[PDB]
Amino acid sequence: LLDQIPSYDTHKIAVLYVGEGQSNSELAILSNEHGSYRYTEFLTGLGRLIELKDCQPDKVYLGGLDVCG
Amino acid sequence: NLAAYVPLLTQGWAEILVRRPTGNTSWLMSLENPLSPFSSDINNMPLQELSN
Amino acid sequence: AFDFLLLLRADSLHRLGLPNKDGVVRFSPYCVCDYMEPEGPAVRLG
Amino acid sequence: ELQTKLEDCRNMIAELRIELKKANNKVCHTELLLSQVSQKLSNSESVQQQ
Amino acid sequence: ELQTKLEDCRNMIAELRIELKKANNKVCHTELLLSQVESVQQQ
């Protein structure tokens, strides 16, 4: 169990893209599959892009994202 | 990368030698901790260490 | 006068806008922030 | 009527951006695939010499 | 009318054309893939 307490502060940060008129629609924000080009480029700067099926959650913090895809 | 991977490979190797009243014990040692990509020298960080 | 003027805004196609009676900005199709230099034909923007 | 045209064009733009997401996701996927291939080739050369 | 025609101008003239250019970018990186495309470790 201690080995499962990480040696580093793990943080999980949500990222949401709000399209036109979705400022008050949770279901519409969550339904978003694409984003504006600026939003796509903004995502690329957040960190390393890690493919989940290659990740080990003990080594790379996935925050609860499933490896299975 | 020729000047990089050998120094990266070696610098975890060590010997701890305990001299005691009854003798000396020593182990050659080699760290399992890799060099941190986030805090090593920022000139170049190739993954050839893991390749070897 | 400043309190009104400083609420002037514009968009990526340069159309100027001011808050309406509800405080929501509308952008004009006829007024643009582009400094026009003085130094059939379509509608001429201001 | 022009509002109907606007909603039609917005539907078209939504499907175009779905296509953009599909294309960019394929770009990311095959970029990671070719990155893995490059790593594999370099590792293979080093491994043969080793 | 102002809002409808202005937002339709935005869509059709900026967004639609930028998306066509992004489809061009799609085929560009697809060409990158199409042009960019053993067990010795055991021993």
Side-chain angles (χ1 to χ4, degrees):
Chain A
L1 184 51
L2 179 68
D3 275 344
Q4 289 180 352
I5 306 189
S7 48
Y8 46 84
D9 293 344
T10 48
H11 304 285
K12 45 182 182 183
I13 310 291
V15 178
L16 301 154
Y17 175 78
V18 187
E20 308 91 353
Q22 299 171 347
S23 62
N24 281 267
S25 183
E26 171 196 71
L27 177 60
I29 303 170
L30 304 188
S31 299
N32 279 321
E33 287 296 297
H34 54 70
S36 54
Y37 175 77
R38 292 179 69 187
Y39 170 74
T40 309
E41 204 277 339
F42 151 70
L43 290 182
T44 66
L46 289 175
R48 281 185 180 180
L49 174 133
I50 59 175
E51 183 172 6
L52 293 183
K53 79 161 177 284
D54 289 358
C55 293
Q56 292 290 344
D58 299 338
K59 187 180 70 176
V60 180
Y61 186 64
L62 300 183
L65 292 169
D66 74 314
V67 176
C68 298
Chain B
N1 299 319
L2 299 181
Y5 50 76
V6 169
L8 269 38
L9 198 80
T10 58
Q11 61 189 268
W13 292 340
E15 274 161 29
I16 180 158
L17 189 163
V18 189
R19 305 176 159 95
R20 307 186 60 128
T22 55
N24 305 359
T25 38
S26 61
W27 309 254
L28 266 158
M29 280 176 128
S30 59
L31 275 167
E32 279 77 60
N33 302 76
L35 282 163
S36 172
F38 319 105
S39 310
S40 304
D41 289 341
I42 331 181
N43 57 329
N44 182 27
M45 294 301 299
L47 282 307
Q48 298 291 353
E49 181 188 350
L50 285 310
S51 187
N52 294 273
Chain C
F2 282 127
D3 185 44
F4 183 86
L5 281 162
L6 283 156
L7 300 179
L8 190 62
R9 311 181 189 182
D11 78 318
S12 64
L13 300 178
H14 303 167
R15 303 186 321 281
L16 287 155
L18 290 153
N20 58 9
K21 301 178 65 177
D22 287 61
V24 183
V25 56
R26 301 180 303 180
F27 299 100
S28 174
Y30 316 112
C31 299
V32 289
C33 197
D34 185 9
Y35 174 78
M36 303 179 182
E37 177 165 299
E39 308 292 340
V43 175
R44 296 181 176 182
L45 306 96
Chain D
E1 295 288 295
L2 274 301
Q3 197 281 338
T4 305
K5 177 203 174 187
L6 183 149
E7 249 296 329
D8 183 296
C9 294
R10 191 189 186 193
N11 200 336
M12 179 180 179
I13 288 174
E15 82 172 349
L16 285 177
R17 283 166 58 161
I18 285 295
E19 281 293 335
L20 172 59
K21 188 233 178 181
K22 185 168 176 285
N24 194 72
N25 189 93
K26 285 301 297 180
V27 169
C28 172
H29 170 220
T30 57
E31 179 175 10
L32 261 61
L33 286 183
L34 264 299
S35 168
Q36 179 70 7
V37 171
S38 305
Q39 290 291 338
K40 185 67 61 60
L41 186 60
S42 179
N43 170 258
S44 298
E45 191 264 351
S46 69
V47 154
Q48 200 277 343
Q49 207 277 346
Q50 186 207 340
Chain E
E1 169 206 338
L2 171 158
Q3 298 164 226
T4 299
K5 71 185 180 183
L6 281 185
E7 296 180 16
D8 177 56
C9 180
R10 285 211 293 111
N11 285 262
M12 192 177 185
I13 307 301
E15 307 294 337
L16 171 61
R17 313 310 172 108
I18 288 298
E19 295 308 321
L20 262 58
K21 289 185 176 180
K22 259 52 188 178
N24 287 13
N25 195 267
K26 151 187 76 173
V27 299
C28 286
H29 288 302
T30 303
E31 177 73 12
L32 175 146
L33 158 70
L34 290 173
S35 58
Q36 206 84 350
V37 64
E38 307 293 337
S39 61
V40 67
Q41 287 182 356
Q42 172 176 334
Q43 183 178 4

